[PDB]
Write a protein that binds this ligand. Structure first.
Ligand SMILES: [Zn+2]
Lengths: 148, 1012, 184, 187, 117, 199
DNA sequence: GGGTTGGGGTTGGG
RNA sequence: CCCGCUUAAUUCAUUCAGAUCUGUAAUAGAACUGUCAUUCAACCCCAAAAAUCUAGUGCUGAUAUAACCUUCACCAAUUAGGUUCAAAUAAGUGGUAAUGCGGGACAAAAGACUAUCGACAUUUGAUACACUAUUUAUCAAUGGAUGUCUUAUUUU
């Protein structure tokens, strides 16, 4: 009953694989993981992917200790600039001598479509990793016990 | 030249606005961006939707939306998801049509209010449009463009983009305002003449007390130093001390005293009050008339006020000459009308700052910067002037007199001594108790209605031989958690009744409410009369006496309950309406915006949940248009509900438990509904329509049984009947009398005005006083029985015209105010009865002649008031009209442009778009010459205008005559080219032009139009 | 919005429709033939159907729906109702904007249906026509409810917490008593 | 030590609460979507003037003190405080809104924030305010949330107001999540 | 387009694995001053030092105070470095909550979501 | 009486005759000063022989109006007091401030020095500005305030910059300045001569 | 600790 | 017309409410006190018009059968007599104001002025200070300005 849920790369891959393997579900974009969800919360390190001849779509990468996913960043059409939250990442990456860092990213995912990335903030404290893991486990248990 | 057209398109109008650089329909934009091609095939309804939809943008963005070969267009998202993505893309911006009724929470959008425009956005046509566009372009198309979708023949509905109402949008000192409105309608009386006991004159009986009571004026920021405050405090101390030595009894006896027979009037009033039996009508009329002739003249009160001010205020507080100026302006203050007021600058601009001697400047600005010193001391002089009038003059007038206006005197102001008004109030209360008002006690009324509704007040307006009570429901009770007055409580039921009002027009009676309905009825009757062959006509006019007080509450509730025209449940919608004005389109200085062409109005409507034909649920509005010009509507997100049970409870309360107050005494109505409530007008019409359809069956089938034309209309309590048969008129009189006898009401003054004469003894009509007149007069309109043409009635003297005009002029916006005032004065009533279907060419010319003669007299006081200000001292006007003759140039400019606009509107009203342009030009020149001749003739005698301005006006009039003659001369050659074929109306216009010989002069036509 | 739905006074419409249904059923079956009365009493079949008049029209927000059992949940402010709908055609005729959930609808006509089950009479409410007018995604927390899919037990619940439900439950029990008196 | 509760518990307890009840909570959450559609500030006197007499030309006069006062602007903001579990609408008063503005822009002083906002709005600079308010989206904090069950215009309603705002530090939040998960696993 | 598993382990499980593609995290040690970078586990009350050979101590940013590495363990107290990130932490890193999280992730009930099978 | 009124009217006509009014012109100025050549009776009330013909002034005004009513030279209507004809019948110490910043306007410095409140004359040259008073005593009544005694410095504020002044110009220089004033007067006289001599 | 939208302007019919 | 000064005295009346006194058939007489008001006052329905008015004209060639001008209070409607793109002398009403006292020769085309003034006086500009219908200062340019006397007798 909650559209937002925190989960990692491995769960994203497992959910997509399960949805694709058995497509006998309702005719709606919503996924099915102990309910219907649209948004996701994940903390993982971010790195740009240099695609070819893809101006409107910018491909990113979110690798983690469990796996990896592919995300797409959209940009404005009336003019050719980047979103502020990713411009900050670009300038910080330039400043710190091209060192990749973990980010706290919120991403919207729908079936039969790519995974949009909406917003992230650079994290500098390693305590966020334990916080994210504990939050993931707690929310998974809450969802399972609320289904029953 | 530019002319008003009855037919226009939205695309043409939008191209005239400089802000929008790109205007086109959706189809041509789709082809321009290569989204679709002409070889592609589409549904006919989708094609129609693409053709009719109109879009616009502030810049050209065709290149940005060009089709890209990188990736095709396939849609997998729903329309809701795309719209949500667009709204999230909007972000913090707060004024967009798609944003109405919703809020954004991060990356989530919440729908919370009813928006009736969402049905268009979430329709199948927009789904197909999304399929054509694609998500990445649809999300930005909804933002960068203004989308108008056609829902009616001429109406459009904006569903996307910035709202249209957003286009319709270092400080300077502002002087205080004289509180002249306080003087009116004071009922309180005291034992000793003077001021109220709460005034600072009576509270004092040192400097401490006066400082405490006058804190608002002692600690003003306009005082430079503490020395000025001390001097002002000493002056106020002297003022207070002097006031207690004024013998008010002697002053009232000397200037404005009671009649010599006051004791006789008091004794008569006391005897009438004490007598148990009903008082005589003639004696009471004589007593009321004698009481009303004790009014005090303006000169008497001006002398009284001057005497009070001279011996109460020191001569050196304002200056030797400023005091005299103030005293002279006091008279002009006294004689102003009801809605007229003075300004502080009317005193300041005629005073000398340096006359005041006790003013002290902390810094020597008297010689270095004289202008700053003058400004600073003017700021104090204005405060002093406001203090004198508001504290002394206004309370004395409010305490010692009752100031009000009469019934047929318009806005003229009358003063009555307080004991006289106490006698009048006693007599009026005696008269009210016998018929419709009874004293009440709060024990009877239940606490629910006591704590739910606020109460009203009673006011008395003098009439010749009687009174006219008015009940006002403005108050709201601070206690019992009431924040609205009774009308605001009954606002929604008024919307429901207004919905009921439309069906009353034709279904269940003969009721009319506005001029358009009356004009349509007259046009239909005139067409039938012309078809019949113009036979003789007979008319009867009669009216109901006290219609509001003659209503039976039980019958009204029974009619309300058993009527099927009022539904159980209603929903309320709010929307904004943009409608074309009467301004022609300029043909392409650079700043042209929407307000130049459109008028913005806020509207509300009540609709039912049934599957009605009007289908308001799909659109959200219901507008009636008299032309083909476009209009735009945008919906709002504030819905409400109202049930028939709530209206029934409101009606039951107002009928049964109406309570009003008068001099701290409560009363209650015994019969009828109160006038002064927003729902009484429709209820009266409904109630009387029921009876009149009960007793007028013979009229329904008479149009076919014996073939006789007849028309019956009733506006409120006034009846008008025009027929072809005298027997029909007699039968109508008899039937209406029977209905009045059976239903307990009666006709005013037992008078009836007809066109014929009949023996009244046969029909038991002996008590009626039949008056025979050959020319019908109804609701201020004069109707001829031979040619059947209608024109309004105008007053004949300047004094009668002046009584209904209030003059308010501000220097900031002289031009706009004066031009709009002239426009309203010409277009007030002439715009509704200038129909070519009612009057002929000569009739229209005569109507214009008389109306313009009235309007010039109406506007004359504004021109005299303008000359009291010299514009050579204002840069804003002197830079444009020079310094030598600024006022004359300003007035000439205003008059010329107003007359031109009025002539254009008249030509738009008279002719159709199919008529040849030369005829329209000739008639416009004729109307302009008529109005300019009237203006020049009226103004040629005045002394203020005698010199420079009349020459310019005469030149304008001569130029109009020459242009009219030239157009008439060239029309013959233009028509002789045979390139044009003339229809019936054009031939009629040519016949009118040639018969009056407009080629040479006007002396043939003047006798026919000037006849009175 | 919540004030808009409260001003509707749906309970009055329900009371009027129930009174009309009871009166019409009493009037139409005055023959009182014992063999016919015994024949009409069998398990699991409807005995009467009274369509509401045109004046009993209201609007509510859809909170949930169930296609397997044709059970639809409606809420307005304080009270939430659990009713049925005739078939999927009712949902298809109403042009929903996005989804049936969180949508404001107008019920054009509904009807009371009488069923005899388990030696007692059950009265249901069935929706026949619906019209969608807007989307309202706003959760309303209804303290109290009444169920039309469980008989007397589904309606009498939460009667002590509201006077209107108490009155409607009393009327419902009176109707059931009259029905079982006349038929049995 | 304090007690921390999630948004869902606050929502469930607020609904069940009778009219006239108040209670306070502590939540770990992020502020989002400050709303600017309504008026952004109001005027009050220094002596707690209940009634402020409106005049023309920026003239004012308090009634609780009876002196010519310079008008004082108080800043009020409505936003949404959302945790992972749920979202609620809240009202932010002068002190907390000034603190947030100072945090997002250190140049503006605390009590000067309302004056800065008023000057930007009246002078015709709304883009700067929009950009300033947009940078506060998804900013984590520690909130003290109070709900009141009160009746306005004879209509029952629940209003959420924020009392305190503190900077976020992940450590005790991580400890609290760990202990809640341990309690859930134990039972 | 590639699935690589980098499970998290503690100091005592390091000997239990004896060569697997894993990830470990710890505070950077500076008192020993080896040529190769040395990181430390725990609150430093108990000595647990591991060294990585691929990555040099001096090349990384001076402001860096905390790091986590992803690579296969070469030997007891030696881990190869494949991917290294830098954390500039102004606050102490809590190791008890991290240990509890690792132990709960290794539990049978919650291991399904963390790792395959 | 009637004869007295007739004699008074004859005397008034003689005094208002066109021939007599030209040589004397004593009442001609009153006629010119009238609003619309309608003089009142107050002018004739100061007469000697006219008053002696009398043998409550409204009664005298009415008598004069009756006497002049039948006449045609004068005019009388509405029983007013005024009268009119039926024809036109027309026909030591001075100081200098120093160290003025270059480019300073004259208006600024003259405004700065005029704050004292007494009239003077100023001329601005490169820096130096001569100022002269009209009477001796204003110098000593002004030097008590223009001298800031708190700082005891001959300082005046001009354009937001501190300027210096000397309390006494050299005696030879004041003689030269007086000679300059005399030269300016002489040059005005010579210019006046030239203006006279262009014709 | 907040809170329909208060006006502005004033002619002509009833 | 402008300017200076002055312009008068005892109650015409006393609602509503409270509280005294005296008389006696409900009538009345005498005296006293408090006092706008739910802190507001402000009738309603229908209909007409609506520029951010430095923005707008075929700026006007016309019909001596016409257009203007003249009247001892002002102002506005009612009659005669003249003149020709602008000019001077008239005859009956309605309505509104009307204290006393003192003053009202520069009319002017000029002359003698070497009395007066870079501190005289305009004229157009500029620069400051002001602007809701300000009564100014300085600068630049420039030429006239102020005052007295002469073409003059209170039957004025
Ligand atoms: Zn205060």
């Amino acid at each position: 009953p909650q559209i937002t849920v925190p989960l990692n790369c491995f769960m994203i891959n497992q959910i997509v694989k399960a949805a694709k393997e058995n497509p006998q579900a309702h005719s709606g974009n919503h996924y099915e993981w102990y309910g219907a969800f649209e948004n996701a919360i994940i903390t993982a390190k971010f790195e740009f992917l240099q695609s070819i001849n893809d101006s409107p779509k910018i491909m990113g990468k979110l690798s983690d200790s469990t796996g990896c996913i592919e995300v797409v960043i959209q940009k404005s059409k009336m003019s050719d600039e980047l979103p502020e939250f990713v411009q900050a990442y670009e300038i910080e990456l330039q400043n710190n001598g091209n060192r990749h860092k973990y980010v706290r990213a919120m991403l919207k995912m729908r079936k039969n479509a790519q995974i949009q990335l909406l917003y992230f903030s650079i994290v500098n404290d390693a305590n966020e990793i334990s916080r994210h893991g504990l939050d993931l486990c707690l929310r998974y248990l809450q969802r399972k016990h609320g289904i029953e | 030249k530019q002319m008003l057209t009855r037919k226009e398109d939205l695309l043409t109008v939008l191209k005239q606005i400089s802000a929008l650089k790109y205007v086109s329909n959706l189809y041509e934009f789709l082809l321009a961006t290569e989204k679709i091609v002409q070889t592609s095939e589409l549904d006919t309804q989708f094609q129609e939707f693409l053709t009719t939809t109109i879009i616009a943008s502030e810049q050209n963005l065709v290149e940005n939306y060009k089709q890209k070969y990188n990736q095709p267009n396939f849609s997998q998202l729903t329309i809701k998801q795309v719209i949500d993505d667009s709204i999230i893309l909007l972000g913090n911006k707060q004024n967009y049509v798609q944003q109405i009724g919703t809020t954004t929470i991060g990356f989530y959008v919440e729908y919370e209010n009813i928006n009736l425009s969402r049905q268009t956005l979430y329709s199948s046509n927009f789904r197909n449009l999304l399929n054509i566009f694609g998500e990445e372009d649809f999300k930005y198309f909804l933002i960068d463009f203004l989308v108008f979708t056609k829902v009616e023949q001429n109406g459009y509905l904006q569903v996307a983009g910035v709202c249209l109402n957003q286009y319709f949008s270092e400080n300077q000192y502002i002087y205080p305002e004289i509180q002249r409105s306080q003087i009116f309608y004071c009922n309180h009386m005291g034992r000793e003449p003077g001021v109220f006991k709460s005034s600072f004159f009576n509270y004092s009986e040192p400097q401490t007390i006066i400082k405490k009571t006058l804190l608002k004026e002692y600690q003003s920021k306009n005082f430079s130093c503490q020395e000025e405050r001390d001097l002002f405090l000493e002056f106020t101390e002297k003022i207070v001390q002097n006031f207690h030595n004024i013998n008010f009894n002697y002053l009232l006896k000397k200037f404005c005293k009671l009649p010599e027979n006051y004791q006789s009037l008091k004794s008569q009033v006391k005897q009438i009050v004490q007598s148990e039996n009903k008082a005589n009508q003639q004696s009471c009329e004589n007593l009321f008339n004698s009481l009303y002739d004790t009014e005090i003249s303006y000169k008497q009160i001006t002398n009284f006020l001057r005497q009070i001010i001279q011996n109460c205020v020191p001569n050196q507080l304002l200056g030797k000459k400023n005091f005299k100026v103030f005293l002279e302006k006091l008279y002009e203050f006294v004689q102003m009308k009801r809605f007229e007021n003075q300004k502080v600058l009317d005193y300041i601009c005629f005073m000398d700052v340096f006359d005041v001697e006790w003013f002290v400047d902390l810094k020597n600005q008297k010689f270095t910067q004289k202008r700053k010193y003058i400004s600073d001391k003017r700021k104090i002089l204005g405060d002093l002037i406001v203090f004198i009038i508001n504290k002394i003059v206004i309370p004395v007038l409010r305490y010692n007199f009752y100031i009000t206006e009469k019934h047929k005197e318009g806005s003229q102001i009358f003063y009555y001594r307080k004991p006289i008004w106490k006698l009048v109030s006693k007599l009026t209360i005696v008269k009210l108790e016998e018929e419709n008002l009874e004293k009440v006690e709060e024990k009877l009324i239940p606490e629910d209605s006591f704590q739910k509704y606020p109460q009203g007040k009673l006011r008395i307006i003098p009439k010749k031989g009687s009174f006219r009570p008015i009940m006002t429901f403005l108050r709201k009770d601070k206690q019992k958690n009431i924040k609205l007055n009774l009308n605001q409580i009954l606002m929604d039921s008024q919307l429901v009744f207004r919905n009921l009002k439309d069906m009353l027009g034709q279904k269940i009676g003969y009721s009319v409410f506005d001029n358009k309905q009356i004009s349509e009825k007259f046009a239909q009757f005139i067409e039938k009369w012309k078809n019949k062959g113009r036979p003789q006509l007979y008319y009867v006019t009669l009216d109901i006496k006290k219609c509001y007080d003659s209503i039976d509450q039980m019958k009204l509730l029974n009619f309300f309950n058993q009527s099927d025209l009022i539904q159980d449940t209603y929903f309320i919608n709010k929307y904004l309406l943009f409608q074309r004005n009467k301004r022609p389109l300029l043909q392409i200085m650079d700043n042209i915006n929407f307000p130049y062409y459109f008028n913005l109005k806020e509207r509300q409507i009540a609709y039912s949940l049934y599957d009605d034909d009007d289908q308001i649920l799909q659109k959200g509005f219901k507008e009636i248009q008299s032309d083909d010009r476009p209009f735009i509507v945008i919906n709002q997100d504030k819905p409400r509900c109202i049930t028939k049970d709530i209206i029934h409870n409101h009606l039951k309360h107002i009928s049964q438990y109406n309570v009003i107050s008068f001099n701290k005494v409560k009363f209650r109505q015994k019969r009828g509904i109160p006038q002064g409530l927003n729902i009484s007008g429709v209820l009266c019409s409904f109630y009387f329509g029921k009876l009149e359809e009960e007793y007028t069956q013979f009229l329904k089938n008479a149009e076919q049984v014996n073939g006789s034309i007849n028309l019956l209309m009733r506006l409120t309590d006034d009846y008008l009947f025009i027929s072809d048969s005298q027997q029909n008129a007699l039968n109508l009189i008899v039937q209406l009398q029977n209905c009045a006898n059976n239903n307990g009401f009666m006709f005013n003054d037992q008078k009836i005005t007809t066109n014929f004469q009949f023996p009244q003894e046969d029909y038991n009509l002996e008590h009626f006083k039949i008056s025979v007149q050959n020319e019908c007069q109804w609701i201020g309109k004069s109707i001829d029985m031979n040619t059947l043409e209608i024109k309004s009635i105008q007053k004949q003297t300047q004094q009668e015209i002046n009584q209904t005009i209030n003059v308010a002029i501000s220097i900031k916006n002289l031009k706009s105010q004066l031009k709009n005032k002239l426009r309203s004065l010409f277009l007030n009533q002439l715009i509704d009865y200038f129909n070519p279907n009612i009057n002929s060419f000569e009739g229209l010319c005569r109507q214009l002649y008389h109306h313009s003669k009235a309007t010039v007299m109406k506007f004359y006081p504004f021109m005299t008031k303008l000359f009291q200000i010299d514009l050579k001292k204002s840069k804003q006007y002197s830079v444009q009209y020079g310094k030598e003759n600024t006022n004359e140039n300003f007035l000439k400019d205003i008059l010329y442009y107003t007359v031109e606009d009025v002539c254009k509107i008249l030509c738009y009203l008279q002719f159709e778009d199919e008529i040849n342009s030369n005829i329209k030009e000739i008639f416009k020149n004729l109307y302009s010459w008529i109005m300019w001749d009237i203006i020049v003739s009226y103004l040629k005698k005045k002394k203020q205008f005698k010199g420079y301005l009349n020459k310019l006006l005469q030149k304008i009039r001569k130029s109009r005559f020459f242009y009219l003659k030239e157009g008439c001369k060239s029309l013959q050659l233009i028509l002789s080219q045979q390139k044009y074929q003339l229809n019936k109306k054009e031939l009629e216009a040519i016949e009118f032009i040639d018969l009056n010989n407009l080629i040479q002069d006007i002396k043939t036509l003047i006798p026919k139009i000037s006849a009175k | 919005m919540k004030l808009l739905l409260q001003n509707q006074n749906i309970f009055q419409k329900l009371k009027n429709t129930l009174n009309g249904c009871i009166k019409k059923f009493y009037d139409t079956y005055q023959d009182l033939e014992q063999m016919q009365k015994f024949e009409m009493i069998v398990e699991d079949k409807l005995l009467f159907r009274y369509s509401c008049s045109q004046s009993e029209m209201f609007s509510a927000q859809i909170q949930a729906h169930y296609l397997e059992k044709r059970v639809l949940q409606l809420t307005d402010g304080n009270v939430k109702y659990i009713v049925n709908f005739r078939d999927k055609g009712v949902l298809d005729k109403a042009n929903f904007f996005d989804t049936p959930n969180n949508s404001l609808v107008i019920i054009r006509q509904w009807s009371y249906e009488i069923y005899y089950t388990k030696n007692t009479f059950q009265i249901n409410l069935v929706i026949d026509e619906m019209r969608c007018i807007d989307i309202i995604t706003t959760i309303f927390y209804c303290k109290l409810e009444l169920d039309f899919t469980q008989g007397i037990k589904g309606i009498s619940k939460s009667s002590s917490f509201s006077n209107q439900i108490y009155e409607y439950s009393a009327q419902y029990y009176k109707a059931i008593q009259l029905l079982k008196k006349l038929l049995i | 030590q304090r007690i921390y509760s999630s948004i869902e518990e606050i929502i469930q307890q607020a609904q069940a609460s009778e009219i006239g009840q108040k209670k306070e909570f502590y939540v770990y959450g992020n502020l989002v979507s400050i709303q600017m559609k309504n008026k952004l500030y109001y005027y009050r006197c220094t002596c707690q003037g209940k009634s402020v007499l409106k005049y023309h030309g920026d003239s004012f006069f308090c009634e609780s003190c009876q002196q010519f006062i310079n008008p004082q602007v108080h800043l009020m903001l409505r936003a949404f405080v959302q945790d992972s579990t749920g979202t609620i609408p809240v009202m932010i008063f002068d002190q907390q809104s000034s603190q947030l503005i100072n945090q997002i822009d250190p140049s503006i002083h605390v009590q000067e924030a309302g004056q800065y906002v008023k000057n930007c709005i009246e002078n015709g600079q709304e883009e700067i305010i929009r950009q300033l308010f947009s940078k506060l989206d998804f900013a984590r904090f520690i909130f003290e949330i109070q709900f009141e069950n009160k009746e306005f215009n004879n209509e029952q309603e629940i209003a959420y107001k924020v009392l305190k705002i503190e900077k976020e530090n992940i450590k005790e939040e991580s400890k609290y999540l760990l202990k809640k998960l341990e309690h859930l696993i134990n039972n | 387009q590639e699935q690589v598993m980098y499970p998290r382990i503690l100091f005592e499980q390091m000997a239990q694995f004896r060569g697997k593609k894993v990830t470990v995290v710890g505070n950077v040690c500076n008192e020993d001053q080896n040529d190769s970078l040395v990181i430390e586990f725990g609150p430093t009350g108990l000595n647990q030092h591991v060294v990585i050979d691929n990555y040099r101590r001096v090349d990384l940013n001076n402001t860096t105070k905390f790091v986590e590495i992803r690579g296969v363990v070469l030997n007891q107290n030696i881990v190869s470095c494949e991917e290294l990130t830098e954390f500039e932490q102004k606050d102490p890193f809590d190791f008890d909550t991290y240990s509890k999280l690792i132990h709960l992730s290794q539990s049978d009930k919650l291991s399904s979501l963390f790792t395959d099978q | 009486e009637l004869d007295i009124k007739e004699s008074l009217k004859l005397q008034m006509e003689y005094y208002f005759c066109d021939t007599n009014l030209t040589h004397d012109s004593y009442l001609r100025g009153i006629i010119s000063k009238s609003p619309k050549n309608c003089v009142d009776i107050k002018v004739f009330l100061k007469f000697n022989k006219i008053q002696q013909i009398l043998k409550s002034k409204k009664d005298l005004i009415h008598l004069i109006r009756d006497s002049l009513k039948e006449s045609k030279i004068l005019k009388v209507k509405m029983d007013s007091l005024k009268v009119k004809r039926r024809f036109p019948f027309n026909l030591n110490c001075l100081i200098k401030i120093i160290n003025i910043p270059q480019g300073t306007l004259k208006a600024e410095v003259v405004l700065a020095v005029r704050h004292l409140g007494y009239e003077f004359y100023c001329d601005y040259i490169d820096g130096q500005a001569m100022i002269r008073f009209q009477n001796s005593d204003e110098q000593r009544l002004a030097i008590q305030k223009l001298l800031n005694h708190n700082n005891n410095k001959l300082q005046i504020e001009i354009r937001g910059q501190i300027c210096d002044v000397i309390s006494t110009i050299p005696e030879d220089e004041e003689k030269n300045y007086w000679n300059y004033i005399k030269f300016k007067k002489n040059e005005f006289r010579k210019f006046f001569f030239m203006k006279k001599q262009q014709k």
